[PDB]
């Protein structure tokens, strides 16, 4: 029982398109069948480094608890086309975020189904049960408004908004780049 | 600015005119055969001024100096670039599938 907003899906596609050649990851925040109200990206390419992940998680927790949200999901898009299984990094990160709330489950952007319009739900949601992580039903509905997610993702990609998208790594490069990336949020609001 | 370049040309041109003058003045001596043995002050002043201005233009033309500390140009080199390794490129990423094949 994992439910994410359409803005979460469009952010998924935006971050996947932003670094198509590099594996990416990030978190999904929700308020306390959990509904992921918002998302946040972090880093790309190399993902196994711990210090960045720790500093990230600390900042995510601070930002979310300051604004009443709590981190409740982890997303990861792998680099390889034929790769759709979690790595060690994804598994440990998902376990650690799920340590707080049991409703936290991992999601991975299956890049095999990554297309212009995102015809099929690219994200696959994995749950942690029996101390093992396994995928949910792919046939399940993932986004709240699938046609809306499709159209907004297509519009954003065709509008070259992926280049404008900023993740945590750009914030690391320079704080002047807003890591909260409300620009894509206002674009989503205008499109919707 | 680029105008600096144009300047140096005129300097040589100025000098060139001086040369003509000098030649003519030499012809003057070669047609006067007097104990002058001195260039006109106007022409020498013109030559000196041309030398000065041309050198001044050259000073701009030389270019800009470069700092010795090797950590100068690498300050703005983010890690997102050095990791690309162009020789070791891989084309099994989501770029091909997402974009038009």
Curated annotation (Swiss-Prot), chain A:
It is a peripheral membrane protein. It comes from the Eukaryota. GO terms for cellular component: cytoplasm; EMC complex; endoplasmic reticulum; endoplasmic reticulum membrane; Golgi apparatus; membrane. One of its GO terms (biological process) is protein insertion into ER membrane by stop-transfer membrane-anchor sequence. Residues 2-132 form the MPN domain. Keywords: Endoplasmic reticulum, Membrane. It is found in: Endoplasmic reticulum membrane. Expressed in liver, pancreas, heart, lung, kidney, brain, skeletal muscle, and placenta. Expression levels are highest in pancreas and moderate in heart, skeletal muscle, and placenta. Its main location: endoplasmic reticulum. InterPro entries: EMC8/9 (IPR005366), MPN (IPR037518). The keyword Cell cycle does not apply. PROSITE patterns: MPN. PANTHER family: ER MEMBRANE PROTEIN COMPLEX, ER MEMBRANE PROTEIN COMPLEX SUBUNIT 8. Component of the ER membrane protein complex (EMC). EMC8 and EMC9 are mutually exclusive subunits of the EMC complex. Belongs to the EMC8/EMC9 family. Part of the endoplasmic reticulum membrane protein complex (EMC) that enables the energy-independent insertion into endoplasmic reticulum membranes of newly synthesized membrane proteins. Preferentially accommodates proteins with transmembrane domains that are weakly hydrophobic or contain destabilizing features such as charged and aromatic residues. Involved in the cotranslational insertion of multi-pass membrane proteins in which stop-transfer membrane-anchor sequences become ER membrane spanning helices. This is ER membrane protein complex subunit 8. It comes from Homo sapiens (Human).
Swiss-Prot record, chain B:
It comes from the Eukaryota. One of its GO terms (biological process) is tail-anchored membrane protein insertion into ER membrane. Its main location: endoplasmic reticulum. It is found in: Endoplasmic reticulum membrane; Golgi apparatus membrane; Early endosome membrane. One of its GO terms (molecular function) is magnesium ion transmembrane transporter activity. The chain crosses the membrane at residues 2-20, 42-61. GO terms for cellular component: early endosome; early endosome membrane; EMC complex; endoplasmic reticulum membrane; Golgi apparatus; Golgi membrane; membrane; plasma membrane. The keyword RNA-binding does not apply. Residues 21-41 are lumenal. Keywords: Endoplasmic reticulum, Endosome, Golgi apparatus, Magnesium, Membrane, Phosphoprotein, Transmembrane, Transmembrane helix, Transport. It is a multi-pass membrane protein. The keyword Transport applies. Part of the endoplasmic reticulum membrane protein complex (EMC) that enables the energy-independent insertion into endoplasmic reticulum membranes of newly synthesized membrane proteins. Preferentially accommodates proteins with transmembrane domains that are weakly hydrophobic or contain destabilizing features such as charged and aromatic residues. Involved in the cotranslational insertion of multi-pass membrane proteins in which stop-transfer membrane-anchor sequences become ER membrane spanning helices. Belongs to the membrane magnesium transporter (TC 1.A.67) family. Component of the ER membrane protein complex (EMC). This is ER membrane protein complex subunit 5. It comes from Homo sapiens (Human). The lineage of its organism: Eukaryota, Metazoa, Chordata, Craniata, Vertebrata.
């Amino acid at each position: 029982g994992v439910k994410l907003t359409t803005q979460a899906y469009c952010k998924m596609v935006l971050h996947g398109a932003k670094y198509p050649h590099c594996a990416v990851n990030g978190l999904l925040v929700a308020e306390k069948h959990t509904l992921f109200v918002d998302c946040i990206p972090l880093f790309h390419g190399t993902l196994a480094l711990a210090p960045m992940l720790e500093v990230a998680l600390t900042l995510i927790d601070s930002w979310c608890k300051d604004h009443s949200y709590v981190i409740a999901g982890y997303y990861q898009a792998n680099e390889r086309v034929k790769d759709a299984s979690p790595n060690q990094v994804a598994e440990k990160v998902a376990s650690r975020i799920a340590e707080g709330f049991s409703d936290t489950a991992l999601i991975m952007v299956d890049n095999t189904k990554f297309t212009m319009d995102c015809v099929a739900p690219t994200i696959h949601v994995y749950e942690h049960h029996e101390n093992r992580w396994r995928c949910r039903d792919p046939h399940h509905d993932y986004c709240e408004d699938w046609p809306e997610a499709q159209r907004i993702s297509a519009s954003l990609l065709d509008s070259r908004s992926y280049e404008t998208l900023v993740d945590f790594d750009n914030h690391l490069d320079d704080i002047r780049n807003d890591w909260t990336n409300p620009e894509i949020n206002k674009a989503v609001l205008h499109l919707c | 600015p680029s105008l600096w370049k144009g300047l140096v040309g005129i300097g040589l041109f100025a000098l060139a005119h001086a040369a003509f003058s000098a030649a003519q003045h030499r012809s003057y001596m070669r047609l006067t055969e007097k104990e002058d043995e001195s260039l006109p002050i106007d022409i020498v002043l013109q030559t000196l001024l041309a030398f000065a201005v041309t050198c001044y233009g050259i000073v701009h033309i030389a270019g800009e100096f470069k700092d010795m500390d090797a950590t100068s140009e690498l300050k703005n080199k983010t890690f997102d670039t050095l990791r690309n390794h162009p020789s070791f490129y891989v084309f099994n990423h989501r770029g091909r599938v997402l974009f038009r094949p």
